[PDB]
Every structure is written in structure tokens, then in C-alpha cells.
């Protein structure tokens, strides 16, 4: 089957070049029976397709007429990929972008997609998290539930990703959209609910990648200062 | 260009029930229509293809129907994982999509678990305090989330957010972040979630005492 992998930094200052690259396996960026796409979302623009390159004995390119002035969309046959480029970004521009796939030259709909972009316009530097853990009580656990977590705090930009003990655990996981701080910081919450059974046969560790700032954080979240390390009192 | 509007922008109907959402193209474009479903935070899916063909590795009860400029998805039988932002899309020219309908899964009333979580000794270091509010696996999606502090109630101090509905047991969970700086958490001592909720016979509280 074909997979369209995305790659690009998710920031771009006002005003300069927005970059990304979508990388094709299981087909070619020069199949004549293919054509490939650019296709951004936000509330501004809803679902906006911005255009394709597609090979015919020839290269041709079509571009929307929102983006014509600003876009350029090249194909790499070396590396089998495809590009985006955006020329003089502004806030209007922040979105998740997506490249996908339409069978011939798209008038069968897009049935392969990337797993998407998303880009911030802003001026603000990549700031990683921290992160906290989010330790129930004791006694709020009597009940047969145990709700854990983890706090991923003054990052920038989005997104963040958290899994909890490398992807093993997913029942019962709710991570949740991050909210902008007062400070132009975001700030999440992932939390797991488990039997409270559990707390002292399992161990409970969230993993926080902030692709932004290369920041992989691996928190491990239990309810005893009697055997920490580092001794208080 | 091509204009296409979705018709309703959103709506709840029951596991089980006969779904049917509209879209309405400008003018006419024959079965040049597609259809997707986008769950949060991925991508759009295909469901449908030249107005009524079935796309590959979909279930059968997603079917797509009319012709001209007006065209209908339906759902034969809802499923819990059914919630999804669906779209439609023209190609007859240069690729427009509608706004999107939100389709959401209406159930029995479920009350929240509350959880209540004070800030980590770490954080504290740092010099600010977030004490966590959690409400967990309810429906419907109104809740009513209050913090005291000494029972004196807050404003302007704390962050809510809220899952998509769950695709299992479609229920909701909210979070509320209460901040402060380290001074004024160690100024107080009792902190308290006040919750109400459809599923509540009266408010629950959850609450800790600092230190």
C-alpha cells in the first residue's frame, strides 16, 4: 500500500518561507496515473486545497488562486518525495497541512493522506515542556479507580505528544487539547485511569515528545518517601 | 469557482439510528462529489467516491447518494465510533469542499468520576502552583466545574479543556487548571473541585489540604 510520510518544522516567522516535504513509499512522485497534493485546514480556511504536481511525459503544477502568488509545489526524483513552499507567511497562514494522493489526476476524491503539519506562524521561540506528574490520593483510589497523569507545561509551539508506558498502555487514556496560557505558552494535561489494584504490581511512566524542541521527557507517575533517592525532612 | 454547503452543521442522534447529512453544490456537478470522516487529530478518510461508490475498507453501512446539486450521506445504523467531522468535496473543477458536518452520539446520562490533584513538590521549586481538576467519562458534555480556596470561590484563575467524545462509550472528560503562584498556594490551605452535573443528584466536591 502507498504511505505519505510529512516532514518540515512547524514554525515560521511572519513574513518568511514556510517548508515541508512529503515523502511517498509504495508508488512513484512520476506515476502517470497519480497526482499529488497540498491540502491545508484551519478555522480560517476550512478544508483548502492549494494545489498539485503531477507527471504526464512532462511535469505540469496547478495552484490555487488563493496561494498562486506565494506557492511553489517541486517534486524530488531522487528521494521520492514532494515539497510545499509558501512564501511570505502571515497569520492567515497557520494550519495543519496535509499532502495526499488523488488516483490519476484527482477526480476519484483523495484516498491517501499524510498524517498532516501543523504550522504556527508566529515570531515566538520553541520553548520545550516540563513535566509534571499528577498523583492521585491514596484514598481517592479506594473506590477500584486510580487516575494518574501528567502535566506538560510553557511549551511553544503545538503540538505535543504523550503516550504512556511507550505506547503499551492506551485504555482509559485521555490527553487533552492544550490551552494558551496568559503567558503565549501552551499548557496540557494526559491522564489514564487504571484498577487501583494495580499501583503496586504496575508501574505508570507518560512519554512527552515536543518534536519542536527535540524535548522527550519520560515521567514516572506513582503514589511512600521512604525508599526516594534524594532524602527530605 | 464551486461553492459547497453542508446541511446540518451539526447533530446527535442514538447508536442504532438512521443517519442522514446533506450537501448542497452551487451549481450542478453531475457525481463529481466525494465524501470524508475526520476523527480528531488525523486526517480526512475517503468514504465515497463518484457521489455513491463505496471506497475501498469501508463499512457497507456508509452510503452515498443524489446527483446534479444535491447529494446525502447516510449512515444506515450508527456506530459509537461513527463520531467524526464529515465533509464533502467537489471535483468537477478545482477541488472545494463543504464546511463540515459534526456528528456526535447522543446516550444515557453518565455522572463524572472527580480526581483532584495538587501541584508536584517540583513545580512548586519553580515558584508556581497547578492544581488539576478531573472529570471523567460523562455525558452529556454540560458541566459546571468551581474552585474554592478556603471556600473562598475563584475567577479568572483556572483553564478548562475537554475531549472529542469518546469513540467507545461516547463520553467526555474535561480537565480544570487552577494556577497560582507558589506565594498564594502556601498562603491557603484547603483546596477544593466543586462539580455539577446532569449525572449528580447534588454537587461533589473533591478536595485536599495543602502539606
Known amino acids: 500500500q502507498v504511505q505519505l510520510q510529512q516532514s518540515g518544522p512547524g514554525l515560521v516567522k511572519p513574513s518568511q518561507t514556510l517548508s515541508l516535504t512529503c515523502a511517498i513509499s509504495g508508488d512513484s512522485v512520476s506515476s502517470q496515473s497519480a497526482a499529488w497534493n497540498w491540502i491545508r485546514q484551519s478555522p480560517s480556511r476550512g478544508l483548502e486545497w492549494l494545489g498539485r504536481?503531477?507527471?504526464?511525459?512532462?511535469?505540469?503544477?496547478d495552484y490555487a488562486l488563493s496561494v498562486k502568488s506565494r506557492i511553489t509545489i517541486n517534486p524530488d526524483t531522487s528521494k521520492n518525495q514532494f515539497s510545499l513552499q509558501l512564501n511570505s507567511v502571515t497569520p492567515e497562514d497557520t494550519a495543519v497541512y496535509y499532502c495526499?494522493?488523488?488516483?490519476?489526476?484527482?477526480?476519484?476524491?483523495?484516498?491517501?493522506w499524510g498524517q498532516g503539519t501543523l504550522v504556527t506562524v508566529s515570531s515566538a521561540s520553541t520553548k520545550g515542556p516540563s513535566v509534571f506528574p499528577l498523583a492521585p490520593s491514596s484514598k481517592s483510589t479506594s473506590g477500584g479507580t486510580a487516575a494518574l497523569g501528567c502535566l506538560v507545561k510553557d511549551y511553544f509551539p503545538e503540538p505535543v505528544t504523550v503516550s504512556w508506558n511507550s505506547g503499551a498502555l492506551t485504555s482509559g487514556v485521555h490527553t487533552f487539547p492544550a490551552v494558551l496560557q496568559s503567558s503565549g505558552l501552551y499548557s496540557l494535561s494526559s491522564v489514564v485511569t487504571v484498577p487501583s489494584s494495580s499501583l503496586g504490581t504496575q508501574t505508570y511512566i507518560c512519554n512527552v515528545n515536543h518534536k519542536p524542541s527535540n524535548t522527550k521527557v519520560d515521567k514516572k507517575v506513582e503514589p511512600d518517601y521512604k525508599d526516594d533517592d534524594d532524602k527530605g525532612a | 469557482d464551486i461553492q459547497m454547503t453542508q446541511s446540518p452543521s451539526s447533530l446527535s442522534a442514538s447508536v442504532g439510528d438512521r443517519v442522514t447529512i446533506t450537501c448542497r453544490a452551487s451549481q450542478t456537478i453531475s457525481n463529481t462529489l466525494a465524501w470524508y470522516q475526520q476523527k480528531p487529530g488525523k486526517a480526512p478518510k475517503l468514504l465515497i467516491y463518484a457521489a455513491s461508490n463505496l471506497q475501498s475498507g469501508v463499512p457497507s453501512r456508509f452510503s452515498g447518494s443524489g446527483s446534479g446539486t444535491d447529494f446525502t450521506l447516510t449512515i444506515s445504523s450508527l456506530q459509537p465510533e461513527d463520531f467524526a467531522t464529515y465533509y464533502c468535496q467537489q471535483y468537477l473543477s478545482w477541488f472545494t469542499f463543504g464546511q463540515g458536518t459534526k456528528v456526535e452520539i447522543k446516550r444515557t446520562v453518565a455522572a463524572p468520576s472527580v480526581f483532584i490533584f495538587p501541584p508536584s513538590d517540583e513545580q512548586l521549586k519553580s515558584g508556581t502552583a497547578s492544581v488539576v481538576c478531573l472529570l471523567n467519562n460523562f455525558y452529556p458534555r454540560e458541566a459546571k466545574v468551581q474552585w474554592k480556596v478556603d471556600n473562598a470561590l475563584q475567577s479568572g484563575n483556572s483553564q478548562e479543556s475537554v475531549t472529542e467524545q469518546d469513540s467507545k462509550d461516547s463520553t467526555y472528560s474535561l480537565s480544570s487548571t487552577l494556577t497560582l503562584s507558589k506565594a498564594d498556594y502556601e498562603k491557603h490551605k484547603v483546596y477544593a473541585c466543586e462539580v455539577t452535573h446532569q449525572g449528580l443528584s447534588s454537587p461533589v466536591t473533591k478536595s485536599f489540604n495543602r502539606g
Open positions: 495526499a494522493r488523488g488516483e490519476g489526476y484527482g477526480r476519484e476524491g483523495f484516498a491517501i
Open positions: 504536481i503531477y507527471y504526464r511525459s512532462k511535469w505540469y503544477n
